[PDB]
Design a binder for this molecule. Sequence first.
Ligand SMILES: O=C1NC(=O)/C(=C/c2cccc(Br)c2)N1
Ligand code: NA
Length: 456
Amino acid sequence: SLLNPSNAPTRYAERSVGPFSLAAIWFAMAIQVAIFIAAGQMTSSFQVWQVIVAIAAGCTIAVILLFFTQSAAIRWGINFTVAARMPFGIRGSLIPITLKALLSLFWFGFQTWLGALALDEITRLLTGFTNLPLWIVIFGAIQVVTTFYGITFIRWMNVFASPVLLAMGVYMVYLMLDGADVSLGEVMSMGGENPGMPFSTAIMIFVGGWIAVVVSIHDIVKECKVDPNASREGQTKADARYATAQWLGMVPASIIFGFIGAASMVLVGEWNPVIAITEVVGGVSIPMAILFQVFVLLATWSTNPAANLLSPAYTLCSTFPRVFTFKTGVIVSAVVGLLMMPWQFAGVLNTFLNLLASALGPLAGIMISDYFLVRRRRISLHDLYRTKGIYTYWRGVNWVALAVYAVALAVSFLTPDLMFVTGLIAALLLHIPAMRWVAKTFPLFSEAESRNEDYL
Ligand SMILES: O=C1NC(=O)/C(=C/c2cccc(Br)c2)N1
Ligand code: NA
């Protein structure tokens, strides 16, 4: 048995996130430093309004993906790590999942760093003392302790951060535009003086940004509110109501702040708003500086935990269920996380983001296909928590699914500027014949699937 209280399906009465609340999580989750860099650097290849469009477009494809990748977790309260067990093996899933937990972990050390930079700036603008690594750990530590309260803290922190972040940001735009003596419409076309990058690969850079979160949303959305006695058509509006809520959370948030990153770049030559606003205004008081840094901290806190730390936690406590618990998995993930020292990664994000999509594109495709197409949403919780059952395949690993991943990865390379969308679609489509083959050796359903509601 692989079950323990932390890695267990989430009972109907334990669910706490409705559609408005999930939006309140996503709005604050989209407000984060890294989108300044991406959308800023985008101004090299396109002008600001197009970048906003590449953001809105990229935000929207992510949501279309969320609608499908979230549907099993909402209905059945299960993990990401647990859910991968279906098409890949019970252990074979560890292969893509280790790929993915690493990614998740990479973002965690990056943002803890940005957070640390902020806190270190606040202090040295007071105490002149400027030690960063201590502030790194301390922040890593602070996130861990606030992550202990799982989605409960997250949900309360993001609803209050959201408007504050929203206001600090609208203010930010005012300060720039004003202090530069420029209208909104004027800045909107000042960019794009070095074309070459396809607009498709632009959209693909923002899609490739959230793909880790989108693919493994489970760990967030297994907490959303569901009515067990709906129907096919009431379940679909429910999925859609949640999917709609994520759109209204991440789009307007990442459009306003994407715009700020782009604006910074285009007005002053730097993606970092500290610099762009400081110059344009010609210095700022120590208070109003500290503010900005409180923002970065508030903006890092609203994104890092929920998006980067939750999912390796659940990966640990659910693979080694007697060794790790959620809280203990959080401690081990944040330590490993910081010991990856991701702040030394050579390059820029865009190409990395272009990497992230085409690396997990087939993974999202194989999971959507297994659950929706092959099995028709008809799953067995019982077998997901047991070493030997209908998800054990060949001695714990489903090599055919690992085969479909490779093949689909290959085909993905045949369309470099659309890598992600071909690899997903390829994996999606190939899983079907591959699974209709495996079904001749192994069963796709189980009698024990009637105990599903016992868990809930
Ligand atoms: O999965 C993710 N964890 C992160 O921290 C993260 C950052 C990010 C997301 C979208 C666009 C951009 Br630009 C950056 N993604
Ligand atoms: Na945030």
